[PDB]
Design a protein around this ligand. Structure first.
Ligand SMILES: Nc1ncnc2c1ncn2[C@@H]1O[C@@H]2COP(=O)(O)O[C@H]2[C@H]1O
Ligand SMILES: Nc1ncnc2c1ncn2[C@@H]1O[C@@H]2COP(=O)(O)O[C@H]2[C@H]1O
Lengths: 197, 49, 180, 541, 78, 101, 197
């Protein structure tokens, strides 16, 4: 694809696990496209408290928010969940790419549309749903992302319990204790690996 | 300009044309009167005229 | 030959902004239009055209069961670069006898909009005449033969014209033999 | 035309008009009723100019007396035009003679009180031809003026459920399929700001139900007046929801019009832009297949070409510039509300064209004072006919001709009957498609027919196809001149009529068809030349 | 048209309770030379005022009531 | 309006283009549309009569039956230039007139 | 200008207040463009109240999320705050519009970026910054986005402690209690119109 003609002038960089891609406050000077790997988009308040905005997986762009306007700082931290083979395009050259071909932009805007939908959903969950419904929607959504195994009748997830903390953005004791409340209600079966019926 | 405007655009004896027929418009162009300023009137003229 | 309905760019009575041909001269250019219908006894056509050049019958949305014998039978003309034209033509099936005048004299019905009614100068009945001869039976030589000179367009078998006529007369006069 | 003339028809059809001229030698580019385009020859074409020698043209128009104006050709392209010829006909002219009326059948009889006193009877068939049916362009208008409450705006918004009978319609709706519209409908929707009125509980409850926002911009739409069967043929103008629909749709209309205007007028020029590269080398297959724009990067050499690379670029500049200009002007002028001038807030214009079939009350006549009012249209089977089965166009009362003493109309009649006598010969020669020799023989036999005719032609001058054009243009009729006091004689018309194989006096037995019989005596038959008038029951009732 | 209208309003208003019809007729000045107020349905019948609002509203529903609103409906298009 | 002949009139008869029949006799047909009540109001009667109901024709004939009307030509020299005939309703735009008068 | 070009393909309807222009559950065929007015988006709850996700004013598109895929159902309700004039086209005409011309899609992309950004701040604040801090981020952003009169000594807003609350998420008498705390803290003044000093 575009990926290989791209790769020949090497901007593709292979980053180890955790190695921070974006430090927010950097001046926006390059677009990315994750060719391999999973990424954490995340933010911090001044008093050390941190929140994850999204994971970002292969096929996705990092940093697009600065391509449109001059001289902006990067909106979130972007840190590698694992080993990442990552494209880099400079803005003044990627805009030439838009000028050459906007076909990419359709798929790009469809992804953005799904992102807006899920973000408005999250504001709804926050304002209007307590912890229980949030982690139900979690374990439900977890029962649909393509890594889940099947457990003959019902869905299976075993991510032990760290990555969910970073997806839904919560503590882990409360996840456990309400994983148990759902176990009483006969909707999950968890002993670390939670089976979503 | 104001004169040659006024007079070419204000008069008796000038009016819209009989367009229904090339005959009517020529014989309108081949037409003669004994009326107008310095002329006659229907009530004053008689049979001799 | 029946009727036309014109509906186009502007208001729709009926020639608008870059047609030479005012309305009765497009329709009289459709009177001599020759159409043959084969399967059915009834038809409706449509037309849409635009842009400078002669507006003819080849542009007609011919129905598949319709034989247009002249695609060069002129209809109209488009003059302005801005001018464009959309209309509908009711080809034949009629009923009864000649024109629009006597038709609406019959027809109390008033019909919705677009519809521009037309005189019927038709197709396979053009002119006629006849001749009474004296039939020669050997003795009854004063008996009569007839000879009917008939003239049409194509599209009708005359024996069919004649059979239809006799069946018709039989069936009218059912109102006088069976009915009093 | 008139079959019977006096000779003065031609110079009057001419001197009511004027003439034209030609251009350089060439090949006729575009052909039309009124325009011709010629392309000048390469040797004649100067190198700087393109030399597309083009001509001008003609159109429709109203009269001072609400009648129609136009011009058409009586000619073909690719034929020599002798100077002073008529290249285009008029309202009342054809090939350069006068045309006031039509030529058709006549029989002089009483008939059941239908030609009692000066009235006229007529077959149905003449209006199947519409040949007397005709037109009246009429006019309608809209002054849009300054209103204190605010300018009259062009828009139309409506409460009061359905703004009724629109309630009862089908799904379609008076704008019904294909933008169809009835009599009474709107053409130009203008609204006028409205004052207020006494605030009675009923109507105030009604505009608390519907609630037209404020200032209640009263309706002033320009409509089809009642019963119109005319043609609102065009609109000139002189400078809410559906407000915006109608005006941005007016913009849809207008930009599509004018985007068309663009794309034609510059798709013209893109040929020369391309070609200008192909001069100075050839990108004989390097030019085309790669996308067209990227050709200036193709063949380029020293001094004289970069100037034209930039002339090319200047075209690229000027043209898109002028579109930016026109866009500004046009888009704002559709986007603007009505706010124009003192008293001229604006003026909108309309003209009509009323054409429908002729009917009793219309006044018809000939050329000897021979008037007549209409009293019925006669079915054809209900016309007098002959053993030929061929029925009469019209029936006239001869009650008055002794007391009217217009015997010239009689002579007119005979000399017309004989002329259809020759026209039918040429008709049969057409359907029978005679050989060139016979056409030559008969037609020169036709021209040199009269006693000692002052006027003389040979056809051996012409080729075959010229005689073919000649016979293919004469079929609506050849005329004849009976000069007024140098007119014809009983001997001539009688010799002429029997040359038609007709009766010497054109007196022929006629058959009624209400019973098929014969009448008692034969009747005078022959063709008169008659006149319509503006003195119509239309114009009287 | 006006005569038929107000005859029909007389015929419609003729059938109410006396209070409904009378407060309505006089309150809208129907059939005399006055401009009556609910301050005056107050000052005249009973110093109650807002129940006159809820009496007028009841009468309007009693009288719009499209078994009656149709002699009024030809006048929608006024 | 313009006149033409009635050859098949009886003496008492005269044409009447029903258009002007209607125009002159609108109060009778309105009163009669209220009497029957199809047009319940004069808005209704006037809109119904602009829309030319079929009953407007039969009731125009009803009202016009036995309903004389005058006829006047200029110049009215003597008494008999103006007379009164019975209507004969027609859709012919020309007045028909008994040829003997 | 290119807005004029867009509107020139459109068909502009008038819509008075409370008009529910878009509903959730119907199918997507129209892209919308607000010629005039201001509108409010909504989501509803399976049993309860609703959430305005954001407000949209003159200059925005509505409907676009359906644009990029066929058979997409409408995601939210969108109700008119004021009487609006809405420039509408169908998506097929829009695909035509994409191929014909750029630079509407770019403005649309810049807007999409801005909206993902501020709802992310909203989520940061819902998760990090407390309700007084949510009022702070919001009355800050509103001092950056104008509708105000710019009072010659001070700043004001027409707020009845209801739009601040609903943007943020709270109840009435309580935020009363707090903005009065802010008054005693010299941070606010209000009587019907709040003066954010
Ligand atoms: N709510 C979100 N959903 C998905 N991706 C996001 C979100 N917020 C930020 N990002 C991504 O994370 C990146 C962080 O830095 P940028 O703002 O430069 O570009 C950002 C987006 O690519
Ligand atoms: N949180 C938000 N911030 C900004 N705009 C939004 C938000 N949520 C929804 N929208 C917009 O509101 C629209 C409602 O209908 P659509 O699904 O067509 O597209 C939606 C987006 O344009």
């Amino acid at each position: 694809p575009t990926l290989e003609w791209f790769l020949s002038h090497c901007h593709i960089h292979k980053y180890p696990s955790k190695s921070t891609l974006i430090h927010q406050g950097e001046k926006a000077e390059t677009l990315y496209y994750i060719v391999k790997g999973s990424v954490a988009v995340l933010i911090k308040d001044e008093e050390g408290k941190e929140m994850i905005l999204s994971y970002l997986n292969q096929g996705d762009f990092i940093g697009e928010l600065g391509l449109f306007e001059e001289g902006q700082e990067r909106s979130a931290w972007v840190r590698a969940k694992t080993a990442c083979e990552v494209a880099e395009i400079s803005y003044k050259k990627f805009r030439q790419l838009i000028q050459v071909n906007p076909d990419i932009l359709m798929r790009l805007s469809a992804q953005m549309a799904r992102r807006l939908q899920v973000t408005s959903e999250k504001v709804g969950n926050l304002a209007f749903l307590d912890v229980t419904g949030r982690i139900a929607q979690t374990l439900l959504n977890l029962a649909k992302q393509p890594d889940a195994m099947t457990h003959p009748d019902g869905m299976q997830i075993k991510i032990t319990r760290q990555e969910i903390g970073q997806i839904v953005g919560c503590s882990r004791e409360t996840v456990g204790r309400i994983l148990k409340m759902l176990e009483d209600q006969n909707l999950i079966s968890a002993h670390g690996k939670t089976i979503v019926v | 300009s104001a004169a040659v405007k006024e007079f070419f655009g204000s008069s008796q004896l000038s009016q819209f044309m009989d367009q229904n027929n090339p005959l009517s418009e020529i014989t309108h162009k081949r037409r003669i009167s004994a009326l107008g300023p310095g002329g006659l009137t229907r009530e004053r003229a008689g049979f001799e005229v | 030959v029946t009727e036309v309905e014109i509906d186009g760019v502007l208001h729709e009575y009926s020639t608008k902004e870059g047609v030479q041909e005012d309305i009765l001269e497009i329709l009289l250019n459709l009177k001599g239009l020759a159409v043959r219908v084969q399967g059915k006894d009834e038809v409706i056509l449509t037309l849409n055209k635009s842009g400078i050049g002669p507006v003819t019958a080849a542009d007609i949305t011919h129905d598949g069961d319709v034989e247009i014998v002249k695609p060069q039978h002129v209809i109209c003309h488009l003059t302005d670069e801005n001018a464009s034209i959309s209309m509908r033509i009711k080809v034949q099936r009629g009923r009864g006898y000649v024109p629009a005048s006597t038709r609406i004299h019959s027809e109390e019905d008033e019909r919705p909009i677009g519809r521009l009614l037309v005189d019927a100068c038709y197709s396979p009945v053009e002119r006629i005449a006849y001749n009474v001869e004296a039939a020669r039976v050997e003795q009854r030589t004063d008996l009569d033969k007839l000879v009917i000179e008939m003239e049409t367009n194509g599209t009708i078998d005359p024996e069919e014209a004649i059979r239809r006529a006799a069946t018709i007369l039989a069936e009218q006069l059912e109102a006088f033999v069976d009915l009093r | 035309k008139p079959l019977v003339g006096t000779g003065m028809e031609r110079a009057v059809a001419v001197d009511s008009g004027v003439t034209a001229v030609a251009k350089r030698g060439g090949v006729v580019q575009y052909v039309d009723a009124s325009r011709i385009v010629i392309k000048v020859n390469e040797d004649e074409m100067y190198p700087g100019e393109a030399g597309i020698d083009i001509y001008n043209l003609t159109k429709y128009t109203r009269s001072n007396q609400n009648t129609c104006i136009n011009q058409m050709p009586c000619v073909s392209l690719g034929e020599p035009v002798e100077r002073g010829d008529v290249l285009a006909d008029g309202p009342s002219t054809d090939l350069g003679e006068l045309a006031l009326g039509q030529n058709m059948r006549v029989a002089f009889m009483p008939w059941n009180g239908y030609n009692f006193e000066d009235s006229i009877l007529v077959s149905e068939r003449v209006v199947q031809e519409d040949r007397f049916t005709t037109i009246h362009i009429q006019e309608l208008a809209c002054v849009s003026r300054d209103t204190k409450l605010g300018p009259e705006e062009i828009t139309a918004d409506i409460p009061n459920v359905g703004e009724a009978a629109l309630s009862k319609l089908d799904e379609s709706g008076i704008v019904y399929i294909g933008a169809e519209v009835t009599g009474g409908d709107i053409l130009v929707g203008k609204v006028t700001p409205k004052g207020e009125t006494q605030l009675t509980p009923e109507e105030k409850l009604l505009r608390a139900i519907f609630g037209e926002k404020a200032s209640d911009v009263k309706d002033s739409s320009l409509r089809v007046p009642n019963g119109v069967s005319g043609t609102v043929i065009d609109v000139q103008v002189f400078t809410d929801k559906r407000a915006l629909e109608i005006e941005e749709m007016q913009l849809k209309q207008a930009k599509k019009d004018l985007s068309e205007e663009l794309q034609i007028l510059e798709a013209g020029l893109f040929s020369r832009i391309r070609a200008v590269l192909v001069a100075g080398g050839v990108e004989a297959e390097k030019l085309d297949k790669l996308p067209r724009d990227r050709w200036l990067e193709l063949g380029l050499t020293d001094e004289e070409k970069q100037n034209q690379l930039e002339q090319l670029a200047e075209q690229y500049d000027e043209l898109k510039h002028e579109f930016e200009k026109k866009l500004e002007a046009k888009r704002r002028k559709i986007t603007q509300g009505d706010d124009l001038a003192p008293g001229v807030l604006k003026i909108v214009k309309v003209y009509l064209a009323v054409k429908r079939r002729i009917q009793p009350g219309d006044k018809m006549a000939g050329r000897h004072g021979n008037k007549g009012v209409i009293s019925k249209i006669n079915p054809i089977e209900d016309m007098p006919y002959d053993e030929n089965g061929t029925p009469v166009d019209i029936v006239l009362n001869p009650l008055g001709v002794p007391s009217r003493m217009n015997i010239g109309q009689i002579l007119e009649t005979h000399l017309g009957m004989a002329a259809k006598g020759i026209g039918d010969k040429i008709n049969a020669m057409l359907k029978q498609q005679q050989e060139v020799a016979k056409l030559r023989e008969f037609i020169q036999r036709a021209y040199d027919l009269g006693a000692d005719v002052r006027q003389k032609v040979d056809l051996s001058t012409f080729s075959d196809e010229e005689v073919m054009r000649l016979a293919e243009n004469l079929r609506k009729g050849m005329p004849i001149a009976t000069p007024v006091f140098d007119g014809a004689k009983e001997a001539e018309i009688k010799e002429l009529l029997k040359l038609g194989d007709l009766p010497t006096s054109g007196q022929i037995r006629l058959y009624d068809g209400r019973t098929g019989e014969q009448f008692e005596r034969p009747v005078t038959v022959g063709y008169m030349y008659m006149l319509k008038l503006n003195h119509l029951v239309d114009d009287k009732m | 048209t006006t005569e038929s209208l107000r005859a029909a309003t007389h015929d419609v208003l003729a059938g109410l309770t006396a209070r409904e019809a009378k407060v309505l007729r006089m309150r809208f000045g129907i059939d005399m030379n006055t401009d009556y107020t609910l301050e005056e349905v107050g000052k005249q019948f009973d110093v109650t005022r807002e129940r006159i609002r809820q009496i007028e509203a009841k009468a309007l529903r009693k009288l719009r009531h499209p078994s009656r609103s149709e002699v009024l409906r030809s006048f929608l298009d006024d | 309006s313009v006149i033409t002949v009635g050859p098949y009139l009886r003496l008492h008869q005269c044409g009447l283009p029903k258009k002007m029949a209607l125009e002159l006799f609108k109060p009778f047909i309105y009163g009669k549309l209220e009497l029957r009540g199809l047009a319940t109001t004069i808005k209704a009667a006037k809109k119904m009569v602009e829309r030319e109901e079929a009953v407007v024709w039969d009731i125009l004939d009803e009202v016009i039956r036995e309903h004389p009307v005058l006829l006047n030509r200029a110049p009215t020299l003597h008494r008999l230039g103006i007379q009164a005939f019975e209507p004969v309703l027609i859709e012919g735009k020309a007045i028909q007139l008994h040829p003997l008068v």
